[PDB]
Structures are given as C-alpha cells and as structure tokens.
Design a protein around this ligand. Structure first.
Ligand SMILES: [Cl-]
Lengths: 211, 208
C-alpha cells in the first residue's frame, strides 16, 4: 500500500531515505556540508553543487532495500521521468522473480501512449477516492502524463494538499522546475515545509531558508 | 452567518459550502420529497432525483437568497452565482451593490483572469479550507468549456464537498458520455454519507 511516512518533522512519500539521512546527519549538514551526501546537501540548501543521477539512484535504492522500499522508489523514478525508465525496468524485471511487480508496469511495456490514455482515466477516478494511497497514485499519474515542465509543476503541486510539501520541493529542485513563471509558488511550497521543519530542526531549516 | 470567512457547514450528513440552504431544506423536507415531490421545492426535487423538471433561474436564486439572509449568507451565495455562470451575473451585481452601502463587498469584485489565475494557484497552496475553496472557485470561473469546468469542480471532493460537486454537475448539465463514470463516483461518495443519515433521500437519488 502507498503509505506516507514521517521522520522527525519531515513528512514524505517519495523520499523516505533522504528524510532519514537528514535525521541521522543533521549536524553534518549544518556544520560540515562539504562532507555530506551531495543529494541531501543540494536539497537542504547547504551546497549549490548538483547531485549526479547516480547519487539520486543510490539514495532511492540503498544496499539492502526490501521490496516495499523498491516499489516506493520506483514510484519516484516514474515521477522523475523518462531519464529513469531504464532503471525502473531493471528494478521491475528483478521483482518478477519473486512474483512482484509495480502496479503501473504497463508504462514499461511499449505502446506508452495508449497506456497513458487509459492511465489518465484511472487517475481521474483514483483522485475521487477518499484515501491517501489513491490520491498519491492520482498525482503520480497526472505527473507522468504531463508533457511540459509548467504542467508537471502544476500537477506535483497537488502533493501539498496531502502535506507532502517536502516531496513537491525535492522534485522541483531535482527537475529544475523553478523559473520566472513558478518562483512565487515555489516560495510558498518551500515556506510550507520550513514552517514544519522549524518545529523539529530549526538549524537545518535556517540553512535551507538562507544558506 | 455573520462572518466574512468562507466556511464549510454541515446538516445531518450533508457537508456543503455553496448550498447550505438546500442541504437544510432536504434534511427538513425529505418525506415531502419522497411522497409529494411536485409540491416540494423544484430545485431540491431535481437535485435529489424526485423530479425531472429543471428548476428556473428564479427557483435557484430564491433558494440561495432566502428572505432575511445575513451578510455571510449573501457572500457565500454570491460565490455560488459566480460558479453558475452568465445567467446569474446580473443577480451577483445587484447583490454586490446592496452590500456596498454597508461597506461590504465580494472579494473577487483576460487581464483579470490571468491575475485571478495566479491568485488561485497561490491560494490552493495555503493550508486552510477557506483558501482551497477560493482556489476551486477561481479555477471554475476561468474554465472555458464544460469538461474543464467539471474537472475543476471535481476538486471539491478533496474537501469532502461531493454534495456541491454533484449539485453543480446536475444544474450545469456537466454529466455526458465523457464524464459519466466520474459523476457516478461523486454521486456514490455522497450517497455513502446519505445512507447513514437520510436513507429516504438516498433511495430517491438511486430510484425515484
Ligand atoms: Cl493524466
């Protein structure tokens, strides 16, 4: 089941290992950020150096990941876009040996366009269900089916309705969705997250707010 | 109510922002809707499936603005008039002129639609029901065709305002071959609440 989790003021669906990293390496990020993980340091505003694709994959799929971790991170791969589809397919092929699969596997099976029209209708009905799990699936589908970056940002912004502002912000940062057309909205998303992080980790929040 | 703030209200299982007088009417008059629907209110009878006669603009306005409405009731019902489109804008302007004598006004009183669009996007990101309702209203107003308008009104279900989404779908004629399966989900969400408090209303809406 798609389940939101929380780590000491960081509420997340898509990025649980990144949230855990920030819990475990708070002092490092605040006091010696050039020793910290590059993906974490970039997200939290402690470095302007961009993470590599490999940095992202290793944070999503740490050694020893179990099937639940893998399935959740495969959702994140889909949200990040076609750059990550080969990684998604490799992870899905491995799961099949255990009789497991990602529930949106039709996206990896050719005729992607036809699958996305069917998924569009599925996602619209999922959003009308009353569970967090269904609403996450709906947002994921709408994000996958977005062509342009402004549309992708608009659909990912719906994560804030589930108090997943952290995830919306991480996607914005990693996918480069902040520009002149979206900057004022990105500021609201960032501030929503920081208003919560201030309550548990104010020094880390201060880095993110300033530097 | 005697407040400027947008507030969701509830009456016996019926949660609503845009149609509080209609919700209360149905709670008070469910047996009449069952047993003598032609003598019941025509707007209520149409929404709940007791009659296929469409209400008039005047029937709808009278339900939204009953005798004795206070300022919050007027302001809320003015939101409803905006979402109901061009046949209701003259009434909106009449009501807004009344309010000005008391130093009150509706807060939304191509260029304006772009400014409104940016305002609605930032409102949706706030953490209050009042801001989310405003955002949905703006997105509805700025919609240019029925399928887009239905898509934006559907967001009301995210605030458990399925009743309002259903009423708008019925009055604006938004149920068609493209939207019918989604309309069924909205209807079923509302029926799920009704089955627990007004089984009679649920039965009419399912049967007749
Ligand atoms: Cl879609």
């Amino acid at each position: 089941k798609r389940e939101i989790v929380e780590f000491l003021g960081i509420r997340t669906y898509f990025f649980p290992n990144l949230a855990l990293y920030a819990v475990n390496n708070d002092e490092l990020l605040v006091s010696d950020p050039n020793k910290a993980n590059s993906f974490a340091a970039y997200v939290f505003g402690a470095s302007d150096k961009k993470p590599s694709v490999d940095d992202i994959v290793q944070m999503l799929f740490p050694s020893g990941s179990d099937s639940g971790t893998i399935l959740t991170s495969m959702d994140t791969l889909l949200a990040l876009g076609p750059d990550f589809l080969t990684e998604f397919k490799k992870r899905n092929q491995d799961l099949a040996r255990f009789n497991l699969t990602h529930d949106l596997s039709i996206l990896a099976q050719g005729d992607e366009d036809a699958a996305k029209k069917k998924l569009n209708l599925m996602g619209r009905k999922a959003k009308l269900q009353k569970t967090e799990a269904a609403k996450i699936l709906a947002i994921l589908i709408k994000t996958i089916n977005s062509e342009e970056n402004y549309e992708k940002f608009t659909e990912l912004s719906e994560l804030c309705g589930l108090d997943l502002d952290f995830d919306a912000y991480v996607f914005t940062k990693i996918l480069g969705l902040e520009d002149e057309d979206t900057a004022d909205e990105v500021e609201v998303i960032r501030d929503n997250f920081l208003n919560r992080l201030d309550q548990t980790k104010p020094k880390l929040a201060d880095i993110m707010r300033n530097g």
